[PDB]
Amino acid sequence: IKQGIREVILCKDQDGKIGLRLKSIDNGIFVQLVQANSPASLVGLRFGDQVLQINGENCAGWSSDKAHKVLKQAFGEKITMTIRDRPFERTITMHKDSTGHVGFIFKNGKITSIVKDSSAARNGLLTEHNICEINGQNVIGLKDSQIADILSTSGTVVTITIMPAFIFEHIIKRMAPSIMKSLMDHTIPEV
């Protein structure tokens, strides 16, 4: 979680899509959803990103409807956005035992309990926090069994990105768990 405000310049695809959904939160605008193989993925927008500006206009106080509206009525050649990097998240670095564990329990993306004398504890992993990314990869919407496989298949060093569940649950409301799994960008970054 960089503590930085960054510029990104966008370019609509042939369908005139960027691949993005924005949710009004606390009078900000925040990335609800990032489509795979989308202009928005390529410039690196991520779930939980804050959109400070769209085309040099502040987003403070905009409805989700107005942000999506703004986005359609944009010219399409260049859409310059100002991004604050994933304000509502935090990233933990953990190591595995020889039993291959970081040492916690989660259910529906959300961590429910922490297992004592584990790296999860040594590093102060919290509960009631939804798993947002793992080692770069947005896992929002995957099944628990699939998340487990990614942690299984991770090296010894695992890097998790969490969000308070009350915030998490406010971002994802009005987005179907179908689309969460289908079209949300669950991919490693292109270089």
Ligand SMILES: CN(C)C(=O)Cn1ncc2ccccc21
């Ligand atoms: C942000 N929202 C709700 C929309 O963009 C909905 N929408 N779709 C087509 C269309 C045409 C004129 C006005 C709103 C229109």
